[PDB]
Each structure stands twice: as C-alpha cells, then as structure tokens.
C-alpha cells in the first residue's frame, strides 16, 4: 500500500556483533558514508575488542534485516497512534583495512600506506586532534580498525562491511564513539545488535539517562525514564509521553509513548538491543561489555 519510501535519506548506522565460535566474533558495520558515491579516499575508524583475522563485504539486505530485529523490539514499548493508511593489513581494490594495536596507531599514525596520502597533513592533521584521542587510552590495548573506503566502493551492492575478529579478554566494544566536536554535544542515530554478552545496568542507566530526546512539539510533553525488568527482559530507556483527545465522539484520551531510546536485554537469549535514534547526549563514549564468560 505504498512504494515511495526509504532512498537517498535512509542512513543512520547499523551495527551487529555476534559470537561465531569459541573465540571469534563477527562485526557488521553500515554507516552513512559507506552508502554514498565517494569521489575521494574516505577514512573512518573504531575500536574492536581483539584483532581482525579477516574482512569481507556483505550484501545490503543485511542492513534491513538487522534494523528490523531491533526496531521491532523497541516498538513493543511505544504507543504511536499516528495515522496509517491502506601491523596487520587487509588490502583490497575498493577498500583497505588496517588493524593495529591502539597505542601503535598513535606513534605511527602519519604512516599512510593505506593510501590516505593526497589528503596530506591538511586532512589527516584533523583526525589526530578530533578522533585519534578518543580511540587510544590508558589501556593501550583496544585495537583500532583503520578503514579507507576508496572510490568505486559504490558500484554494485554489498556496501556492508564485516570484521571477523578474536576478542581479547572477554571484552566487546560496540563502537558508538564519535569525532570529538568543538560544540560539546553529540547526536546519536544508531541501532545495534550484539549478543552473547552479559547485561550491565550501571553503564546503561548512565547513558540512557544522559539522553535528550527529540521534540513532538506539544507543551504537555514529559520525558520519563524507565528501568523495567520483565520476565526474560530488562529495558533501560527514555520515552516522550503526552495525552491526546478524541477527534469526534466521546471524550476518550490517548496516552502516547514515543521516541523510545535506550537498551533492551533479553535475559534468556542473552542478546542486547540498542536504539539511539536522533537523540543527543554530551556523552561521547563506546559501550563496553563482557562476553558470557
């Protein structure tokens, strides 16, 4: 009943991280930049628990399959009453990934055999001040994935990237970190699907709580914070709520609950659903977890 949706506008960020075997996990990453016709070599980077043993290109169908399993989980919380109808390279032609030991990246950074050269200092210089500092820390481990999507990446499908890596220390670092900006505030637009990890309401209350939800343009709107722990669930999230009135007959009210963003955990399944859709927070950090030990 409609076919003019999602196009050159649907591009938040979709990340899935699941455990493939004993000491191996696969990371699927889909961001805005990966879905656009790049004309120049683009660089992006993040943190991974361990080192990358292989990199591959998955099919875009994967983007919608991940955003569904998640968007649905947070959808059973909402009450939207809107009107409906009836030293370790991984080269390739298009990209080039490099996975070095966090600290090592700082010391050698300049070295761009990943061919992000012609961007010269006037371009790399930037990343050392606004991103790099937010990728390396007192825990010199934390491997840094260095990716360099080179033009041509657009041709064909399979824009999604996948990283087969070996977790060091039972740690999992779902990459939410951004590029330190002058302003001080960060906007989040991401959905995540990580599994085989143990809950942790200490760092989730912290995050969710520092979330500033979008406005529904209603004076009556109140943003509540939640912390439920149902049967096989435990959700930490914030919703924007406001009551509405009938449009015809009786005086029946309609309590809305929308813009739900937070973390939902499946106590049984041991899976973690993340949803930070267009929410702002002064907190620009990564979510670290522990693999079911």
């Amino acid at each position: 009943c409609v076919i003019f949706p999602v196009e050159i506008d649907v591009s938040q960020t979709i990340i899935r991280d699941c455990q493939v075997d004993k000491q191996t996990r696969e990371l699927v990453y889909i961001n805005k930049i990966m879905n656009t016709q790049l004309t120049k070599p683009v660089l992006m980077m993040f943190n991974i628990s361990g080192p990358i043993r292989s990199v591959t290109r998955k099919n875009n169908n994967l983007r919608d399959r991940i955003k569904s399993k998640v968007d649905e989980q947070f959808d059973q919380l909402e009450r939207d009453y809107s009107d409906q109808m009836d030293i370790k390279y991984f080269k390739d032609e298009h990209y080039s990934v490099s996975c070095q030991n966090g600290s090592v990246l700082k010391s050698k950074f300049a070295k761009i055999l990943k061919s992000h050269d012609y961007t010269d200092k006037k371009s790399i210089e930037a990343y050392e001040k606004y991103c790099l500092p937010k990728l390396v820390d007192e825990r010199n481990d934390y491997y840094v994935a260095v990716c360099v999507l080179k033009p041509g990446f657009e041709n064909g499908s399979n824009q999604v990237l996948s990283f087969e890596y070996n977790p060091i220390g039972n740690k999992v670092i779902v990459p939410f970190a951004h590029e330190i900006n002058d302003t001080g505030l960060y906007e989040y637009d991401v959905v995540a699907y990580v599994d085989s990890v143990q809950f942790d309401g200490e760092q989730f209350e912290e995050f969710v709580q520092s979330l500033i939800l979008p406005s529904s343009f209603k004076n009556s709107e109140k943003v509540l914070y939640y912390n439920e722990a149902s049967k096989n669930k435990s959700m930490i999230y914030k919703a924007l709520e406001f009551t509405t009135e009938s449009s015809w007959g009786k005086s029946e009210k309609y309590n809305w609950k929308i813009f739900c963003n937070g973390f939902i955990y499946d106590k049984k399944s041991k899976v973690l659903y993340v949803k930070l859709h267009n929410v702002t927070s002064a907190l620009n950090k990564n979510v670290i977890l522990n693999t079911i030990k």
Partner: protein, 243 residues
C-alpha cells in the same frame, strides 16, 4: 408533488459489515504485498457503523476477516435472498485497496464493479426499486492528495438505478485510518449520520458534510489530505428515521 424512498419496514435491511484486519496470508503469498501491515483499529469503525445502523433499525450482519473468494460468496448469498420486507440494503467494506479494487485477507484484488454490480435490479429482483447503499473504506492509489489553501470557510425502471456508493476517497489517492480512533471517512460518516438522521436529512445532504470534515482532517505527518467522493444513481431522497 414529491418522492422519498420507503423506509417503513421495522427491520429496515441487512448490513453486511466486512471488517478486514489480518493480511498475513497476503504478506506471504502475494509478493508485492509483503511489506503490508494489518489494519489496526478497523474494529472501532466496525463497532461504529454497527452502533449507527442499529438505532437506524438495521439488522446488522457482521463478517470477520474475509478473503476475496469468501467475500464474493458472502455477497452471492444476500443476493438470492428475499428483501421484500426490507426497504433498504447496505454493504460496508473495510480493508486495503488500490485503483478500483478491494484487497481481501488472502491478498488478491476484487474490482468494486464486480461487487457492487452483484446487486443490480436483475441479479436481485427483491431489491429492485429499493436503495442499495455501499460504503467502501479502502485505498485507491499510492498518491497522497495535495492540499490547496482555500482562505475562507406499475412500470419498468433502469437496471442500475437506486445506487448510492460512498467512496472513502477519490481515485488514485489514499485513505487514512487511525489506530486509536478509527478511520476518517467511516467515523465522519457516522458522527455526521448519527446526528443528522434525527433531524430528517437525506444521505446526499449528510455526505456533503462528510466531505467537509475529512477535507479538514490533515495528515500532520506527510502533509496529506483525504477527499471522499460519493456517486449515486438514486431516484428519490434517501432518509431513515428512528427512535
């Protein structure tokens, strides 16, 4: 001097209310219709029309989630029936649709012509000369209707006569259904009916108001507009009094 459709019959007439909610069978089979949701809220209108045409002395005859084939049968039934003691026959279809068609639980279309022509004077001699009303709450295209700024406010009779056809929306455009309250057309059709019927106004008058309301209802989101559009081949004022 004058003329008005006879409405005396205590049991005015039947009211086949085909309420379609689950389009699962369709999301599977018909490929194009896999990204199709269910019509949530339809129930509010189903209970809305039932309440309305109740005080209006109509013997409502509700029908679950019907598939095209069932619908046709349901209609082929109330066609061989006698309606002599009945002075009016109403049919309401609620479900998804497209260009002059009404999807069923299954997922295959069903041209309106093939539904409404099932009750001509020939096919049903019993309803000949008696008003046959049809209200079709469904989509009729993928296009959204734009909204322009008004800045104001003994013998033989034809075979297809006495027909009233209420279209939730003009053609090529979309109908709007709200999960919490119900659907615009159907809700206005009632709020406007259930109120104007006491003061004795024909349906043709009442539908003009309905066009007024739904024309004001705006799809806050995608700047949408819905514009109902009836069609009739009636011969006298259609009006039903109550108590």
């Amino acid at each position: 001097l004058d003329k008005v459709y006879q409405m005396k019959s205590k049991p005015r007439g039947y009211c086949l209310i085909i309420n379609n909610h689950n389009f699962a069978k369709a999301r599977e089979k018909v490929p194009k219709l896999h990204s199709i949701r269910d019509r949530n809220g339809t129930h509010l209108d189903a209970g809305a029309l039932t309440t309305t045409f109740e005080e209006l002395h109509f013997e409502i005859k509700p029908h679950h989630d019907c598939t095209v084939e069932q619908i046709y049968e349901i209609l082929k039934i109330y066609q061989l029936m006698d309606h002599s003691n009945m002075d009016c026959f109403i049919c309401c279809i609620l479900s998804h649709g497209d260009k002059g068609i009404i999807y069923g639980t299954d997922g295959q279309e069903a041209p309106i012509y093939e539904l409404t022509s099932q009750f001509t004077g020939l096919k049903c001699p019993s309803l000949a000369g008696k008003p046959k009303v049809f209200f079709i709450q469904a989509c009729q295209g993928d296009n959204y209707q734009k909204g322009i700024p008004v800045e104001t406010d003994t013998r033989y009779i034809p075979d297809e006569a006495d027909f009233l056809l209420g279209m939730a929306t003009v053609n090529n455009c979309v109908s709007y259904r709200n999960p919490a309250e119900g659907t615009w057309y159907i809700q206005s059709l009632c709020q406007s009916l259930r109120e104007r019927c006491p003061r004795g106004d024909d349906i043709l008058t009442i539908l003009t108001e309905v066009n007024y309301e739904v024309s004001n209802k705006d799809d806050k989101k995608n700047m949408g507009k819905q514009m109902p559009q009836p069609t009739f081949t009636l011969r006298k004022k259609l009006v039903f009094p109550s108590d």
